[PDB]
Design a protein around this ligand. Sequence first.
Ligand code: HEM
Length: 153
Amino acid sequence: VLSEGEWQLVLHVWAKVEADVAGHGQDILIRLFKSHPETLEKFDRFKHLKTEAEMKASEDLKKAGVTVLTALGAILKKKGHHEAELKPLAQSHATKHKIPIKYLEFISEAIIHVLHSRHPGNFGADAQGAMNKALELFRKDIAAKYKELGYQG
Ligand code: HEM
């Protein structure tokens, strides 16, 4: 369970993301797909993209980035009270997309990498620790829902 002070470090860096969610989403998805190319195979719409240049030019990838960060933003703003937000996400990601918890770990690593690069003003050691705690809480609660839904993850 996070402290309020931990949540405030999460939400202070998220406010900087929100200056340009589309730009942050492009950097995070590109870092994910470069670090773990197997994750790109889950995306029928743009799994054909071969290069970072193609990824940066993809309007569909930019929309995916906005969607992921907006949904995660809504979850973080609940400060752990995210049961309602996680239900539909768990069901789609378990049953339709088939996203293992390992891949949620990979995108968490991508988010931390991009925030550390972009936001040294709001992403010092304490803030990164708070964000890791919030993302570990998210993955713990998703993993519990995957199990309820019948997915090994
Ligand atoms: C912070 C983690 C994540 C959040 C908040 C998130 C949220 C979403 C949302 C809101 C959607 C659209 C509605 C839906 O289908 O449920 C979506 C779609 C999807 N997500 Fe995620 N997601 C996350 C992580 C992942 C990861 C790591 C992958 C794959 C490696 C993944 C694969 C997909 C796919 C394949 C779609 C459908 C995209 C399409 O049809 O073009 N998601 N996700």
